[PDB]
Amino acid sequence: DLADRFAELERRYDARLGVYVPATGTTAAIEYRADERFAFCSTFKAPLVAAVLHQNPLTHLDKLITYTSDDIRSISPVAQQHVQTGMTIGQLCDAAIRYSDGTAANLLLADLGGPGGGTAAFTGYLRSLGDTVSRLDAEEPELNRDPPGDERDTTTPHAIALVLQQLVLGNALPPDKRALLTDWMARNTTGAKRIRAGFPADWKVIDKTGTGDYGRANDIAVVWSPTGVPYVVAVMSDRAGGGYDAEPREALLAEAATCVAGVLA
Amino acid sequence: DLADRFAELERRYDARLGVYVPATGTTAAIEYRADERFAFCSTFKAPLVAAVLHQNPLTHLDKLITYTSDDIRSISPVAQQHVQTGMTIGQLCDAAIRYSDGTAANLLLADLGGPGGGTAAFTGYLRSLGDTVSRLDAEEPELNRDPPGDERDTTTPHAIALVLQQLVLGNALPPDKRALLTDWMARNTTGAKRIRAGFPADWKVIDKTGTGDYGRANDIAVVWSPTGVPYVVAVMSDRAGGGYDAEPREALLAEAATCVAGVLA
Amino acid sequence: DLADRFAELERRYDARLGVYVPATGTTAAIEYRADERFAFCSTFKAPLVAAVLHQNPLTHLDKLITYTSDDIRSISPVAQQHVQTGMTIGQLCDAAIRYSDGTAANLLLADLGGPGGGTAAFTGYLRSLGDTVSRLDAEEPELNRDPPGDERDTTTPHAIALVLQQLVLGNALPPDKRALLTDWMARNTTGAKRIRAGFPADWKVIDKTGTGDYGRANDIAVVWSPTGVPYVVAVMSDRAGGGYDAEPREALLAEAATCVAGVLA
Amino acid sequence: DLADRFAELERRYDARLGVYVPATGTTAAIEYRADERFAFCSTFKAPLVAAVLHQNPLTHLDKLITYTSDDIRSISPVAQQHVQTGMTIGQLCDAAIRYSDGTAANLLLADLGGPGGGTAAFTGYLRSLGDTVSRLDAEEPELNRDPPGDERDTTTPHAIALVLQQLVLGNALPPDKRALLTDWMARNTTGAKRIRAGFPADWKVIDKTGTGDYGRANDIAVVWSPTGVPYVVAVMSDRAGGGYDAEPREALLAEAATCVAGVLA
Ligand SMILES: CO/N=C(/C(=O)N[C@@H]1C(=O)N2C(C(=O)O)=C(CSc3nc(=O)c(=O)[nH]n3C)CS[C@H]12)c1csc(N)n1
Ligand SMILES: CO/N=C(\C(=O)N[C@@H]1C(=O)N2C(C(=O)O)=C(CSc3nc(=O)c(=O)[nH]n3C)CS[C@H]12)c1csc(N)n1
Ligand SMILES: CO/N=C(\C(=O)N[C@@H]1C(=O)N2C(C(=O)O)=C(CSc3nc(=O)c(=O)[nH]n3C)CS[C@H]12)c1csc(N)n1
Ligand SMILES: CO/N=C(\C(=O)N[C@@H]1C(=O)N2C(C(=O)O)=C(CSc3nc(=O)c(=O)[nH]n3C)CS[C@H]12)c1csc(N)n1
DSSP states (O other), X not given: OHHHHHHHHHHHTTOEEEEEEOOOSSSOOEESSTTSOEEOGGGGHHHHHHHHHHTSOGGGGGOEEOOOGGGOOSOOTTGGGOTTXXXXXXXXXXXXXXXXXXXXXXXXXXXXXXXXXXXXXHHHHHHXXXXXXXXXXXXXXXXXXXXXXXXXXXXXXXXXXXXXXXXHTSSSSOHXXXXXXXXXXXXXXXXXXXXXXXXXXXXXXXXXXXXXXXXXEEEEEEEEOTTOOEEEEEEEEEOGGGOTTOOOOHHHHHHHHHHHHHHHO | OHHHHHHHHHHHHTOEEEXXXXXXXSSOOEEXXXXXXXXXXXXXXXXXXXXXXXXXXXXXXXXXXXXXXXXXXXXXXXXXXXXXXXXXXHHHHHHHHXXXXXXXXHHHHHHHXXXXXXXXXXXXXXXXXXXXXXXXXXXXXXXGOOOTTOOTTEXXXXXXXXXXXXXXXXXSSOHHHHHHHXXXXXXXXXXXXXXXXXXXXXXXXXXXXXXXXXXXXXXXXXXXXXXXXXXEEEEXXXXXXXXXXXXXXXXXHHHHHHHHHHHHO | OHHHHHHHHHHHTTOEEEEEEOOOSSSOOEEESOSSOEEOGGGGHHHHHHHHHHHSOGGGGGOEEOXXXXXXXXXXXXXXXXXXXXXXXXXXXXXXXXXXXXXXXHHHHHHHOSXXXXXXXXXXXXXXXXXXXXXXXXXXXXXXXXXXXXXXXXXXXHHHHHHHHHHHTSXXXXXHHHHHHHHHHHTOSSOTTTHHHHSOTTSEEEEEEEEOSTTOEEEEEEEEOTTOOEEEEEEEEEOGGGOTTOOOOHHHHHHHHHHHHHHHO | OHHHHHHHHHHHHTOEEEEEEOOOSSSOOEEESOSSOEEOGGGGHHHHHHXXXXXXXXXXXXXXXXXXXXXXXXXXXXGGGOTTTOEEHHHHHHHHHHXXXXXXXXXXXXXXXXXXXXXXXXXXXXXXXXXXXXXOOOOTTGGGOOOTTXXXXXXXXXXXXXXXXXXXXXXXXXXXXXXXXXHHHHTOSSOTTTHHHHSOTTSEEEEEEEEOSTTXXXXXEEEEOTTSOEEEEEEEEEOGGGOTTOOOOHHHHHHHHHHHHHHHO
């Protein structure tokens, strides 16, 4: 009956919807298109920050990174104001999560090092977490513009939910670094119209959004019930049949989240 | 499937839960003990105001009612501040809906006139709406104290939801009086932790609460989707197995509402 | 120059305005009718909670308080829904500050003990803080109704600011109790249209509001600059010349706060 | 008075600050080095779009401009994503205002035509607005690099504020083109930490930023009071004493804006 309502939303919004909520002790898993591939878009910036935190001590966050005007090749609301001043690693992590800063993600990818400007090392980090499906192949802004059917720069709701579960709820990160990642996502400024809009206000929601061409709109979140029980919610969508210029529908993710909230209440 | 989760809420909270959402063109009716009887408690105060509005011209709202300290019997946050000044019919209507003022409802019942302090005339008003099941037999605070199994001062989720549907969405009242009733319910101060707490913030919620002994906690609401689609939600509960002193559980109503929101999303 | 602009606000809004900001190391004191008396209204609920916290160990917050329908004499958005359940001292403190619950303040006054239902003991607590001007003489809701010129239930911007400074910035309370008082005021739900509205968003503002008859509208706040510099802001106003039914003007408090923010910038 | 606090900010941030707020019916002009010259930096891009709108019908917005990677020489977050596709004049206007795209400004200057890549024609356009002082002499990125004392690529807070006043509040443009310019500046992505950060959130702020060498940081804005009263605010700064590499300080402009908001309150 839940798949029937997801299918109605897919028809209402002319979209393909992917939802995954990992099973808990009390609740069964919610799976809609859990193993179909959807484009990361900016959702990769949350595990990216985890990759930077994982392989560096906390003192690395205070390292100052300098860059040029040539490095501003995508939507960079924070980095575009700090070409002359430079940006610390902590500010780049803060910027990548809370403002989805594209230049900040590229600098953090470079901070990981290796082939492809850090894209291979980020994929390797997901592999180390048990994610065998996901792959990052390009930097900003190219990774948002892969045509439908292309497996590059794609993940699945299943894979990204289990990744996010380990980062926030598991022990992929020590408690001090885990709290930083959680606080950045908790103070995100881009997800008000997605999973947060579909859950009651007394539920706590931390999230990282993704938006791209072909109507792509994603939101990955950890939510806590009023009783403090945590859940991982991955919602991914695109409108690829509507072409490159297809508009993303945030209301689709909000409605999908409301459906998920009904089963979790 | 939805009944399994309502019955799970009944089991979690040791309660009997009644839910009714009238069917629309797009949605099927939601029914969970929809025709079982539950005590009105203070939910009758919303149709009571409609009875007063329908029977009287608007100028009747300015009629001054004087009362003494002896007339205060139940929770009356407004009437207790106006013994010396008296209260206009409009103030009694405002107080009865928005603050669930018990003394205000008794004065409005008396304004209806007839046997039982207006309870026969109020019941007759429900009959004019097609509700042949519901009945009011006592005033505040006795109407909250009937033992389980007693049909007096009871309604059903089915009956009260259809009553509210006609008052707010239908044409039981002319538009000017309909707006007064609707705005009072929209600015209610007693329902923040019930149906309002179970719906996402971008859903508009107007409601009237009810609370009594035997763990009785009700909330009747009209809710509007983000796209402006209205739904009537009747949620009733009691915990009679815990005796007269059973405590109402507002969280039961919030969780039940979230389940309803999932089906309506 | 600043007093000329305070006087212009007084003329625009048909109001009497009181402002006090204690001097700091870098900034001089701001005073506009700083020692004239204004009605407390619900601003006393913040030092009231401080008196309860200071006089009792933290574990006292878990004591359950039971009350009756006769105790709901005032606007009590939280207490009115908990007659059957009771409320802990901690919940009453939360309700008194964040929802300005009138019954909760009366129950906390009773917890202080002594003559006048705690009004003498609360006043005595202010005396221990150096406040020789302020006085509480009635409970809710009477303390909001004193006519202009009556010194009862009045304070001054100077005195209430120095009280708030010691409670939040000083050592009137041990750090654990201080954090509870600060967090409650930080999550207050009643002050969005006053001092908070007059300061830039990157300034942190914690506040406790007061509103009454005779156009009375107060807001006492501790504000932190973007650089983390704290200031105490007390703004009090009434429109007593317009009578008992005079409407309070929240915009007066916001505009006055904006004037203060310019001098503190 | 107010000048004493601006000079305080000049000392705190080791900067030269220029402020101008045109007088209105209610307020007197605010002037602090209002007629001293400061470099345009990116602030000319707002009247630049007005020049392009003024000299052409709306259909000119749909003209496609093609360019190469060699034409990208400044911070160009949008133009670097459209080398292969090209961009319409309308997109160039959007990018120049909201993202301060340097390549977009050069293409729009070329669309104005004439010697110096359009700088003479843009200077002539300012003359048509009554601005006899300001001048643009170079393109991006050279216009940010003029040494102190050089009059090239300079304006004054007085002149540009009156220019902005005519473009947004006056009748320099027909209503449809004025609305496009207004909406573009309203949706700017570069000024969150400047004038916008210094005004309360309920003040509407549209702005155009400027940043260059020698610590140059400008922001020209139109702000609306909560009552809908508009004001033009020009805030310019440089820190030439710190050399070419002197860092701009955005907080200076936010603090100066807070000072302005206090007197406009
Ligand atoms: C005898 O009169 N008593 C009261 C009274 O109980 N006032 C209290 C007081 O100071 N309170 C405060 C608060 O903390 O400010 C508030 C918060 S102010 C407020 N009022 C609204 O109507 C609204 O929609 N939003 N907000 C934020 C509620 S009343 C209580 C009163 C209220 S208006 C009036 N003329 N009198
Ligand atoms: C080649 O890149 N194309 C992008 C792009 O830059 N994508 C990134 C991505 O996923 N980003 C995110 C985010 O984290 O969601 C965002 C936040 S989304 C957003 N923007 C608003 O202006 C707004 O008002 N609300 N919201 C929710 C910005 S783009 C970047 C794009 C943006 S819209 C579209 N059709 N394409
Ligand atoms: C919607 O519920 N939430 C509330 C709440 O209870 N609001 C109530 C509401 O509608 N209120 C009203 C009024 O009737 O206008 C008021 C006005 S009280 C009042 N006004 C007068 O003009 C007067 O002469 N006397 N008095 C006593 C304040 S809040 C309460 C709340 C309290 S604190 C907070 N953050 N929310
Ligand atoms: C006031 O600015 N605040 C921003 C911010 O920078 N918003 C920007 C804004 O207006 N944006 C826009 C757009 O141009 O429409 C977009 C879309 S950009 C885009 N659209 C397409 O259709 C497409 O094909 N490709 N791309 C790249 C998203 S946010 C950025 C912000 C970023 S995170 C946050 N909380 N705020």
